[PDB]
Design a protein around this ligand. Sequence first.
Ligand code: HEM
Length: 153
Amino acid sequence: VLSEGEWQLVLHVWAKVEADVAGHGQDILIRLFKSHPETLEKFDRFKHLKTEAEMKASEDLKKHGVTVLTALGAILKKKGHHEAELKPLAQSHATKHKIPIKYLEFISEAIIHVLHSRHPGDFGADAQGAMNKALELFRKDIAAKYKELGYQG
Ligand code: HEM
């Protein structure tokens, strides 16, 4: 499981991504596109965005980061029982956007990178391990959905 303890470490630091959802989402999506450029090819809107300055200036990119981070957060707060919210995500991601599960792993590490970037005294080894554990669960339940629809494998 995640224990009660670890969900607590998870939701404690999410509450301070909540205080600036938009600069967080923006850092994460740039960390992604930067570490893994083939991900940008999945977005039609964002493939004009060659440099990092252009990325940071795009308002459209920032709105997206808000969309992902508040869907993500809605899932984290559901802790454990997160099916209602994770199903629609899986459907669209598998059968529309064509987002391989591997990319969900890339974005997980960008999230943990970015929260290390901004949250030292709240993001220590025990919260990192909680967080990694909660991105895992998320990635595994999506993966189940994917198997079932006949994507990825
Ligand atoms: C924590 C991971 C992610 C979450 C929670 C997430 C959440 C969302 C949500 C809420 C939307 C709008 C509704 C929908 O289409 O489902 C969306 C759109 C989209 N996502 Fe994701 N997404 C995630 C990861 C990714 C990744 C890894 C990519 C690309 C590599 C991706 C590519 C897209 C695309 C291309 C769209 C369609 C709209 C647009 O053009 O941006 N998503 N996602």
